[PDB]
Subunit: 103 residues, 5 copies
């Protein structure tokens, strides 16, 4: 069980930590078919997706995907500092696996 | 994969982008039978719905319909600037497909 | 498809609009068996229920009834102005069909 | 159908109204197996539970018990004044049936 | 039935109270496969998880795990002072069974 986002990120292939230390600049969400996704940007231009859920996801996985989009929305609206994102960087835009907030 | 709401909107037939750059003037929801919908308006007069959940929306989509109303509700109550809406324009009032916020 | 709460309200029998243009004065909620409901009041005395889910309600209404109670809770705690309610006025208290917020 | 917490409470055996007119002093929450419950206190000394969902609870109450723990959490975090609680006084600590907020 | 986090904690094996009396320093959440978890840290260095939900959890447990992550997120973003945690201390990092807030 990892104790921090970096270690967690390290357990997957084709991941990377972005250290933003900045609030979210823009928040985009879509309910359109095959594109039920969220997209966030930062003032420096970095863009990240929360990928659409699939049939391959069990309920508790689907609740994590939804939770993440919830977290992103509420972080945006409270202007919470995003410390780090763990992303998958073999996708475009980079696909969020995890988030950390601090300060 | 889209990196913003305009790219995403352009993937669908019978969609257009509206540019608001304004907070929601009014938020309406109903639990009346076959009208379980949200409706928002902008001071400029524009009116939009979130559609009644129905048989065209698979599970990810019914979830995202529920998330859209959660978003519109919290956006209204925080006076968050709505940047753009992607809508189906083959409905009256136009039906929301995606939202971007970026005050 | 209706563009506002008045037009939506006009599609049902035994409904009427109340124009309140006021914040909620009190919010009450219950988990007692067969009284799983909320009740709101306004400073003018007007008193409203979200009904206990029962045999009068179709399936599609059940998520919406839960959503309406969430909306009333957060409206109360944000002191949000309630513009209008659509109610069934053959019930005591009057039973909420829809709500519009504007300010 | 009751119009207020007191008349709702009066419909049940082994209940009483507490009149608090105070914010919640503490909020406690457990996920521990067979103690999935919330406990709140007021500065006066008063301790109340939301009961572990159990045999005494009918279907409709399960959702409402979830909502009630939601409401007590956000009441605490918003320093919302609690007016009254309806409780079962044959439980220790006394078990919450209903809550009212005014201020 | 316990009246407080300390009494509830003492009912289980392999548990302990941590007394933090401090707001959450960092909040980390993951949507990644088999790492659907939150992790929080305090300034004194203490690091805690909410367990990954899985086939070994009953629904009551699964529900109470999603609630705990809701609680930790909003407690973080409101800078709510955490009084105590009841945790299982045979896990790394220690796994939250219960949280108390007073302040
Ligand atoms: C961090 C980078 O931000 C850019 O906006 C994206 O186009 C890249 O794919 C990547 O996500
Ligand atoms: C943007 C437009 O706003 C108007 O109020 C509506 O009546 C139209 O149907 C469309 O949705
Ligand atoms: C009967 C009432 O007349 C008023 O003009 C309207 O504003 C209300 O919505 C309602 O329709
Ligand atoms: C209202 C009373 O508060 C006290 O703290 C509790 O110990 C009693 O059981 C009862 O719930
Ligand atoms: C309370 C302790 O915090 C430390 O940071 C962790 O490394 C330990 O495993 C334990 O959870
Ligand atoms: C949890 O922690 C991570 C970093 C891996 O070491 C796993 O083996 C462990 O279960
Ligand atoms: C994904 O996004 C859409 C909008 C198209 O440009 C695709 O080619 C891209 O892969
Ligand atoms: C949908 O809305 C209702 C209120 C009626 O005006 C219909 O004509 C419309 O199609
Ligand atoms: C609903 O309210 C309760 C309190 C009773 O008085 C019933 O008559 C009524 O239908
Ligand atoms: Ca600002
Ligand atoms: Ca802060
Ligand atoms: Ca304003
Ligand atoms: Ca802002
Ligand atoms: Ca005020
Ligand atoms: Ca306002
Ligand atoms: Ca205070
Ligand atoms: Ca107030
Ligand atoms: Ca601060
Ligand atoms: Ca405080």
């Amino acid at each position: 069980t990892p104790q921090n986002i970096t270690d967690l990120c390290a357990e997957y292939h084709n991941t990377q930590i972005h250290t933003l230390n900045d609030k979210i600049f823009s928040y985009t969400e879509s309910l359109a078919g095959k594109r039920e996704m969220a997209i966030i940007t930062f003032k420096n231009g970095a863009t990240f997706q929360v990928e659409v859920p699939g049939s391959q996801h069990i309920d508790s996985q689907k609740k994590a995907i939804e939770r993440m989009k919830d977290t992103l929305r509420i972080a945006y609206l409270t202007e919470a500092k995003v410390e780090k994102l763990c992303v998958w960087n073999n996708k475009t835009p980079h696909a969020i696996a995890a988030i950390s907030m601090a300060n």
